[PDB]
Design a protein around this ligand. Structure first.
Ligand SMILES: [Mg+2]
Ligand SMILES: [Mg+2]
Lengths: 235, 238, 232
């Protein structure tokens, strides 16, 4: 029997640059810290590796595949080993299993990214919705204010404007525009498109940018090699 | 040894698995909602809590059962290796699968109650916010009406009935009487229908409160864990 | 020697609904997140629990994470003379620690309501003094304005733009109107900003915080103290 060992750890910032750049488009200032993404990716690799190790052992011809921390009081790196029938085999078989686990995690991350895109899209559409509700409630308040001013202008018998149309009118001074013009305003303000702040148009643009994201455009790795599978020794 | 161990590997649920629960928390707390990652940790924390309680109870029997939960890899928090030692291979697998489902059902009942408590807290916080904001809007309106009532005394003495101005920006306690006693009387007479002025936060808060009432517990497809590996059918004894 | 065990974790949102609400009433948008309160309360429970065990070790009582490398839940145990005794002594000690953590928080909350109550009532008093001083300045200005308006023989308003009326051109209003302002000065309302009305409302809400209604737990039971069937 022959033992090949390798040392794996979380992927580099450069390896996850794209994945990190996608999470920033989806969540913005709420995007996970680059270090948190690295921990999640190696967590998912470690998970799938343990499942392979437990399955390889539960066979008619069991295969010993291991995973343990390389350093005593440290979470990472991880030492992964395989026991093969030949020296060529133990080393290749360990390298194949590491690649097999990576391919499974890559399929999992593709699904996870789609779920993250959906949540981000939901958060942005919900933002557009509340902003639309406040724009509509603001428009209705203005109409409501002109309708009350029209009542004052009717009692004060103000038909023609007294004020030379001020862009800064108020609930109190509105009646000075006269019945005539206030009736016209209750029409114009009712058909007036909703007024949004730039944040609305930015949220709109953030939503289009999420649509522009692709999984294929990101070469995402769930691990990094510290040491590649070693040439085995007789054991 | 005449004992068979079935093993399973569990971890925190996927983002997709808890998309509903996370949305509920966002509807209830808004910007104060827990991060999606924090929800995942809490849910798996809750699953392993209930699992550990089952394991401690299964050991405290006339015929003790060994049900174990531990991190799969040393020094890692997740994933978790759950295992059970049965009388047969088919038995150990079914008994572990049943116990995992039993813990999940208990956790699910707990989360249903917790969600109801969360919807109550969120509602009370938003209701308190609208209340406070309505009083300030109403107190602001009453101040203006008392100012108008005062100004009407100044207009009655100066015998100002019709408006005296041809270009107004905004009026103060001093300048209000220039609108004339006729307009001022009209404003007091219709003070009841004068609309309250609120900030956008009020309209947002009011909408958040309606959306909380839209939340359903059965509509959430929530599970507290994810299987990495389902309970194994052991080939050989332990 | 029988060991009774229990599994404890952070309290539920429902369990600390009262504590969280009082923090929200006192701090508003600066209040701690409900999840942060849960972590703090269980942190306080474990620390008081370890403190009790340490004092008990000075003449048995243990606290440790249930699952290796998971901060929560926590496994607590006690070794008693009987299974029935071990169970009751663990339950009593858990309740004892809970009462101590609850008493420390009751006291902390009272300190917080006092400081808040102080800060808000100082804010209202400052604002009331400024509103009254502003009103008095304006009345002095109106009285001075009336003297000029009498001399300039300006009785009816001479204002075509409200923009023309400043604290130095009040005489533009009627001498008739300025007399009316001085005559009805006592009923001229004090002008406060919305912040005053908000502050006042916040003060009433803090004063509505009653300890008679609230009851909070620094922990939740995952598993109650076991009745051990065998010695160990
Ligand atoms: Mg005159
Ligand atoms: Mg005043």
């Amino acid at each position: 029997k022959w033992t090949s060992t390798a040392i794996i750890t979380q992927p580099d910032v450069g390896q996850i640059a794209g994945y990190n750049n996608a999470m920033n488009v989806i969540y913005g200032q709420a995007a996970p810290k680059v270090s948190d993404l690295q921990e999640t990716l190696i967590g998912r690799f470690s998970s799938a590796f343990s499942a392979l190790a437990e399955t390889l052992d539960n066979q008619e011809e069991p295969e010993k595949l291991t995973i343990e921390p390389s350093v005593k009081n440290q979470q990472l790196p991880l030492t992964v080993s395989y026991v093969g029938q030949t020296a060529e085999g133990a080393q290749m078989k360990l390298a194949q299993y590491i690649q097999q686990v990576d391919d499974k995690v890559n399929q999992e991350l593709e699904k996870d990214l789609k779920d993250n895109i959906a949540l981000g899209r939901k958060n942005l559409q919900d933002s557009l919705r509340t902003q639309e509700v406040v724009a509509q409630e603001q428009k209705d308040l203005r109409i409501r204010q002109i309708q009350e001013a029209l009542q004052y202008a009717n009692q004060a018998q103000v038909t023609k404007p007294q004020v030379q149309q001020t862009e800064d009118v108020t609930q109190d001074t509105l009646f000075l525009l006269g019945s005539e013009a206030l009736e016209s305003m209750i029409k114009h303000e009712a058909t007036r498109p909703l007024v949004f702040s730039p944040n609305y148009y930015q949220t709109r643009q953030n939503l289009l940018d999420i649509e522009k994201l692709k999984f294929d455009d990101l070469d995402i790795h769930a691990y990094r090699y510290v040491m590649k599978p070693t040439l085995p020794i007789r054991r």
